[PDB]
Scaffold this active site. Structure first.
Site, PDB file in Angstrom:
ATOM      1  N   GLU A  35       0.833  -1.200   0.000  1.00 17.48           N
ATOM      2  CA  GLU A  35       0.000   0.000   0.000  1.00 17.48           C
ATOM      3  C   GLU A  35       0.875   1.260   0.000  1.00 17.48           C
ATOM      4  O   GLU A  35       0.551   2.211  -0.710  1.00 17.48           O
ATOM      5  CB  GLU A  35      -0.885   0.040   1.251  1.00 17.48           C
ATOM      6  CG  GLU A  35      -2.023  -0.960   1.206  1.00 17.48           C
ATOM      7  CD  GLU A  35      -3.065  -0.809   0.113  1.00 17.48           C
ATOM      8  OE1 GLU A  35      -2.964   0.149  -0.692  1.00 17.48           O
ATOM      9  OE2 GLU A  35      -3.949  -1.719   0.006  1.00 17.48           O
ATOM     10  N   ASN A  46      -8.042   8.819  -5.695  1.00 16.42           N
ATOM     11  CA  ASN A  46      -8.815   7.842  -6.454  1.00 16.42           C
ATOM     12  C   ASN A  46      -9.659   8.555  -7.503  1.00 16.42           C
ATOM     13  O   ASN A  46      -9.954   9.737  -7.364  1.00 16.42           O
ATOM     14  CB  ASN A  46      -9.662   6.986  -5.515  1.00 16.42           C
ATOM     15  CG  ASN A  46      -8.788   6.224  -4.549  1.00 16.42           C
ATOM     16  OD1 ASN A  46      -7.881   5.524  -4.974  1.00 16.42           O
ATOM     17  ND2 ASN A  46      -9.014   6.392  -3.264  1.00 16.42           N
ATOM     18  N   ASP A  48     -12.684   8.412  -8.045  1.00 16.63           N
ATOM     19  CA  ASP A  48     -13.959   8.813  -7.459  1.00 16.63           C
ATOM     20  C   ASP A  48     -13.812  10.079  -6.617  1.00 16.63           C
ATOM     21  O   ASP A  48     -14.800  10.558  -6.065  1.00 16.63           O
ATOM     22  CB  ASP A  48     -14.648   7.678  -6.683  1.00 16.63           C
ATOM     23  CG  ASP A  48     -14.047   7.321  -5.323  1.00 16.63           C
ATOM     24  OD1 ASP A  48     -12.960   7.841  -4.981  1.00 16.63           O
ATOM     25  OD2 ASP A  48     -14.667   6.526  -4.599  1.00 16.63           O
ATOM     26  N   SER A  50     -12.147  10.334  -3.809  1.00 19.04           N
ATOM     27  CA  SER A  50     -11.682  10.000  -2.469  1.00 19.04           C
ATOM     28  C   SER A  50     -10.155   9.933  -2.493  1.00 19.04           C
ATOM     29  O   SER A  50      -9.553   9.912  -3.564  1.00 19.04           O
ATOM     30  CB  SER A  50     -12.254   8.691  -1.929  1.00 19.04           C
ATOM     31  OG  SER A  50     -11.773   7.598  -2.705  1.00 19.04           O
ATOM     32  N   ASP A  52      -6.671   7.995  -0.422  1.00 20.17           N
ATOM     33  CA  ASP A  52      -6.149   6.991   0.496  1.00 20.17           C
ATOM     34  C   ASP A  52      -4.975   7.589   1.280  1.00 20.17           C
ATOM     35  O   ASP A  52      -4.148   8.297   0.696  1.00 20.17           O
ATOM     36  CB  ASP A  52      -5.621   5.779  -0.289  1.00 20.17           C
ATOM     37  CG  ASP A  52      -6.687   5.065  -1.088  1.00 20.17           C
ATOM     38  OD1 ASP A  52      -7.834   5.032  -0.660  1.00 20.17           O
ATOM     39  OD2 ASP A  52      -6.343   4.549  -2.134  1.00 20.17           O
ATOM     40  N   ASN A  59      -9.111   4.878   3.127  1.00 17.22           N
ATOM     41  CA  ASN A  59      -9.837   5.699   2.171  1.00 17.22           C
ATOM     42  C   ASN A  59     -10.807   6.662   2.871  1.00 17.22           C
ATOM     43  O   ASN A  59     -11.418   6.307   3.875  1.00 17.22           O
ATOM     44  CB  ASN A  59     -10.570   4.770   1.200  1.00 17.22           C
ATOM     45  CG  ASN A  59     -11.162   5.488   0.012  1.00 17.22           C
ATOM     46  OD1 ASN A  59     -10.437   5.914  -0.887  1.00 17.22           O
ATOM     47  ND2 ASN A  59     -12.475   5.625   0.016  1.00 17.22           N
TER      48      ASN A  59
END
Ligand SMILES: [Cl-]
Ligand SMILES: [Cl-]
Ligand SMILES: [Cl-]
Ligand SMILES: [Cl-]
Ligand SMILES: [Cl-]
Ligand SMILES: [Cl-]
Ligand SMILES: [Cl-]
Ligand SMILES: [Cl-]
Ligand code: NA
Ligand code: NA
Ligand code: NA
Ligand code: NA
Length: 129
Positions: A35, A46, A48, A50, A52, A59
């Site tokens: 990650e 992201n 969308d 959002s 992380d 998220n």
């Protein structure tokens, strides 16, 4: 902060992640590797909208508040910035809620794709724990 492999294993164990929800410490270390490459300050936007955050790339859609993710929740009750701290406490506490959500560590798609089913104990091999 960029942790060393065994240094992060020890921190995760100290905060009670080892065998949390039945996931051995190597699972958690593996997930962190892919990650964030063990970097607490990792961030990723992201499609969308959002974002992380942190060593386990948690998220903003569900788990933390960053003020810029429309329609989102903050189920860990934290600013997403806490997930970037050299102190992994907020990351760990939030990961415990995430892994309890129903799908186990499948919540982390990198865990499913790169760690699940592999020799994850390799990630803690050699470490004084
Ligand atoms: Cl490594
Ligand atoms: Cl392990
Ligand atoms: Cl805000
Ligand atoms: Cl928001
Ligand atoms: Cl909420
Ligand atoms: Cl906040
Ligand atoms: Cl820590
Ligand atoms: Cl599970
Ligand atoms: Na994180
Ligand atoms: Na949010
Ligand atoms: Na944290
Ligand atoms: Na891989």
């Amino acid at each position: 902060k960029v942790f060393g492999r065994c240094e992060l294993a020890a921190a995760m164990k100290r905060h009670g992640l080892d065998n949390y929800r039945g996931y051995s410490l190597g699972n958690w270390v593996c997930a962190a590797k892919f990650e964030s490459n063990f970097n607490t300050q990792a961030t990723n936007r992201n499609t969308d909208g959002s974002t992380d955050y942190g060593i386990l790339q948690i998220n903003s859609r569900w788990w933390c508040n960053d003020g810029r993710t429309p329609g989102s929740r903050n189920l860990c009750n934290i600013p997403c910035s806490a997930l970037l701290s050299s102190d992994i406490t907020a990351s760990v506490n939030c990961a415990k809620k995430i892994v309890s959500d129903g799908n186990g560590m499948n919540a982390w798609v990198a865990w499913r794709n790169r760690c699940k089913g592999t020799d994850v104990q390799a990630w803690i091999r050699g470490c004084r724990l």
